[PDB]
Structure 1
């Protein structure tokens, strides 16, 4: 019988009590990254994260930091491999920058052979060290030209441009890559990119954020989400019909959260919590497992929710061999009004829920996850049991999928000096506490989870935060980015992997 801790102090950092041998022998352990966050702009075209961070510098991070040079994994990809080799990792999730291999967006405009060679060398070097690549096609870095020609995922033209890009990736790299992810965290661009405008491309309703160049927070998240699903599904059909000889697997990435009632004896809070599961997870998982959006979304969102044609429904339903599930935290849910006629209405309001980390009796859900120095009541807190609840729910609600946990991690402040930053015991505690619950749900619920990739390999440009926070299991000095030095957490993870 497995017992896992939910509150500090944690004791799961002792590899005598929790280690890779606690899991099945075939289980994959590694780390994750994304191309905008680590490579730098050298050698690639420009994408909407370049555009957004340059046009709206105060949304790039408090430091106005961006991905221009970052940790220079363009130059230092071998040093990334060396971290993975030091860890004895068996998996690495990275993304391909579309703008590196097709700078002009549309494949017929030509490819960047040198860009293709960069990924070929990375892939070869990973395989040579026994590391299985998990490759994300699209981690948000859409070529700027596509955004400017047709507003990117706002238009159905994205579908064919994404498909041609993916086809190029399968053709060039699929002989060696056997695990593909389509779109990172389906929820994120619709809501953050086209709802709140926290993220590229930065569209919203005028009264939501007067800085947005265009948009409609009430409608565009749904359009974008629908096109993401169709683009994803077209790519999965291409993969499975034209690249079956490669013997690989493909899936989307979901951002997952658990949700608990703000007040667990209040029917209204309980209802809000179930609405959140449908609006946050089901928005994408309903289409992926059934070809339709959740009924509560159909009912609430009304004419703002696009329909799938019968052909589209069939394409989207079942369009995965596995799911990449990212998990960071859990929220309490309580009712909230949905003012659809308000000029500042957003799609996120349609769930009719307000989300917190503190429940009605004042209980904070778990340890600190992210401090917000401008407003401490907005701090995020984590909840290790949430990974168990999420995986259990996916097995039960969504037809017992094959799952890889494709991100899980925690930041530490960029104001810490190097010594404090390397003594990242808070990261050991976060990682180990989640891994305890992940082992527990695999054993107790028989969820088909076959790997775990912690966020992040190294310190990088963090979307929305610049270099003001660090997520790496290895430290990078921003004054000289060559080295990636294992932190206490990297050292711990090394021992967890090879106890």
Structure 2
């Protein structure tokens, strides 16, 4: 019988008690990254994260940081491989920058051969060290031209441009890459990019944020989410019909959270909690498993919710071989009004829930996850059991899928000095406590989880935060980015992997 801790102090950093041998022999362990966050702009065209961070510098991070140079994995990709080799990692998730291989967005406009060569060399280097690539086609970095031509995922033109991009990736890299992710965290671009305008492209209703250049936070999230699902599904169909000879697998990436009632004896909070599962997870998993949106969304969102035609429904339903599930934290849910006629209405209000990290009796859900220095009542707290609850839920609700955990990690402040930054015991505690619960759910519930990729390989540009937080298991000096030095967490993870 497995017992896992939910509260500090944690004792799961002892590799005598928890290590890779605790999991099945074939289980993949590694780390993850994304292209905007690590590569730099050298050698690629411009994308909407360049555009957004440059047009709206205060939204890029408090330091106005951006991905212009970052850790320079364009130059230092071998050093990334070296970190993975030091870890004895068996997996690495990275993304392909669309703007690096098709700078002009649309494939008929030409490809960048040198960009293709960059990923060929990375892939070959990974495989030579026994590391399985998990490759994200689209980690938010849409070529700027496509956003300017037709507003990107707002328009159905995205589907064929994404398909042609993906086809190039399968053609060039699929002989070696056997695990593909389509779109990173399906929920995020619709809500943050087109709802709150916290993320690229930065569209919203005028009274939500007067700096947005255009948008409608009540309608556009739904349009964009719908186009994401269709573009994803078209790419999965292309893969499975035209690239079956490659013997690989493809799936979407979900951001997952668990949800608990703010008041577990209050029917209204219980109802809000179940609505959140539907609106947060079901928005995408309903279509992916059934070809339809959840009934509560149909009912609430009404005419703002697009319909799938019968052909589209069939294309989207079952459009995955596996799911990449990202998991960071869990929230308490309580009821909240949905003011659909307000000029500041957002799609996120349609769930009719307010989310917190403290419940009605004052209990904080778990240890600190992210401190918010402008408003401490907005601090985020984590909940290790949430990974158990999420995986169990996916197995039970969503037809026993094959799952890879494609991100899990925690930040430390960029205000810490290097010695403090390397002494990242809070990261060991977060990672081990989640791995304990992941082992527990695999054993107890028989969830088909086959790998785990921690966020992040190394310090990088963090969306929305610049360089003001660090997520890496290896440390990067922003004054001289060449080295990636394993932190205490990376050293722990090395021992966990090879105990």
Partner-residue secondary structure (3-state), 2:320: coil
Cα deviation, residue 301, structure 1: 0.0
Cα deviation, residue 393, structure 1: 0.0
Cα deviation, residue 389, structure 1: 0.0
Cα deviation, residue 355, structure 1: 0.1
Cα deviation, residue 464, structure 1: 0.1
Cα deviation, residue 52, structure 1: 0.0
Cα deviation, residue 354, structure 1: 0.1
Partner-residue secondary structure (3-state), 1:92: strand
TM-score (norm 1): 1.00
Partner-residue secondary structure (3-state), 2:404: strand
Cα deviation, residue 377, structure 1: 0.1
Cα deviation, residue 213, structure 1: 0.1
Cα deviation, residue 340, structure 1: 0.1
Segments of structure 1 that go 5 or more residues without pairing to the other structure are none
Partner-residue secondary structure (3-state), 2:2: coil
| C-alpha distance in structure 2 between counterparts of 1:49 and 1:394, whole Å | 31
| C-alpha distance in structure 2 between counterparts of 1:449 and 1:410, whole Å | 21
Q: Show CA shifts across 1:198-246 (max 9, x none).
A: 0000000000000000000000000000000000000000000000000
Partner-residue secondary structure (3-state), 2:259: strand
Partner-residue secondary structure (3-state), 1:461: coil
Q: Show CA shifts across 1:454-493 (max 9, x none).
A: 0000000000000000000000000000000000000000
Q: Show CA shifts across 1:312-351 (max 9, x none).
A: 0000000000000000000000000000000000000000
Q: Show CA shifts across 1:252-300 (max 9, x none).
A: 0000000000000000000000000000000000000000000000000
| C-alpha distance in structure 2 between counterparts of 1:90 and 1:239, whole Å | 24
Cα deviation, residue 78, structure 1: 0.1
| C-alpha distance in structure 2 between counterparts of 1:491 and 1:233, whole Å | 39
Cα deviation, residue 442, structure 1: 0.0
Partner-residue secondary structure (3-state), 2:44: coil
| C-alpha distance in structure 2 between counterparts of 1:126 and 1:88, whole Å | 11
1:276 is matched with 276
2:323 is matched with 323
| C-alpha distance in structure 2 between counterparts of 1:103 and 1:392, whole Å | 41
Q: Show CA shifts across 1:353-387 (max 9, x none).
A: 00000000000000000000000000000000000
Partner-residue secondary structure (3-state), 1:210: coil
| C-alpha distance in structure 1 between counterparts of 2:147 and 2:140, whole Å | 12
| C-alpha distance in structure 2 between counterparts of 1:85 and 1:122, whole Å | 13
Partner-residue secondary structure (3-state), 1:2: coil
| C-alpha distance in structure 1 between counterparts of 2:295 and 2:468, whole Å | 41
Cα deviation, residue 3, structure 1: 0.2
| C-alpha distance in structure 2 between counterparts of 1:241 and 1:437, whole Å | 37
| C-alpha distance in structure 2 between counterparts of 1:235 and 1:291, whole Å | 16
Cα deviation, residue 426, structure 1: 0.0
| C-alpha distance in structure 1 between counterparts of 2:351 and 2:493, whole Å | 38
Aligned positions of 1:22-421 closer than 5 A: 22-421=22-421
Cα deviation, residue 103, structure 1: 0.0
Partner-residue secondary structure (3-state), 2:354: strand
Cα deviation, residue 15, structure 1: 0.0
Partner-residue secondary structure (3-state), 1:105: coil
| C-alpha distance in structure 2 between counterparts of 1:265 and 1:442, whole Å | 29
Q: Show CA shifts across 1:129-148 (max 9, x none).
A: 00000000000000000000
Cα deviation, residue 432, structure 1: 0.1
Q: Show CA shifts across 1:387-426 (max 9, x none).
A: 0000000000000000000000000000000000000000
2:463 is matched with 463
Cα deviation, residue 436, structure 1: 0.0
Partner-residue secondary structure (3-state), 2:416: coil
| C-alpha distance in structure 2 between counterparts of 1:348 and 1:420, whole Å | 37
Partner-residue secondary structure (3-state), 1:40: coil
Partner-residue secondary structure (3-state), 2:326: strand
Partner-residue secondary structure (3-state), 2:483: strand
Kindly report the root-mean-square deviation, in angstroms, between the aligned alpha carbons of the 2 structures: 0.1
| C-alpha distance in structure 2 between counterparts of 1:4 and 1:454, whole Å | 19
Cα deviation, residue 185, structure 1: 0.2
Q: Show CA shifts across 1:164-205 (max 9, x none).
A: 000000000000000000000000000000000000000000
Partner-residue secondary structure (3-state), 1:324: strand
Partner-residue secondary structure (3-state), 2:123: helix
Segments of structure 2 that go 5 or more residues without pairing to the other structure are none
| C-alpha distance in structure 1 between counterparts of 2:352 and 2:89, whole Å | 42
| C-alpha distance in structure 2 between counterparts of 1:165 and 1:246, whole Å | 17
| C-alpha distance in structure 2 between counterparts of 1:259 and 1:209, whole Å | 28
Partner-residue secondary structure (3-state), 1:17: coil
Partner-residue secondary structure (3-state), 1:115: helix
Partner-residue secondary structure (3-state), 2:136: strand
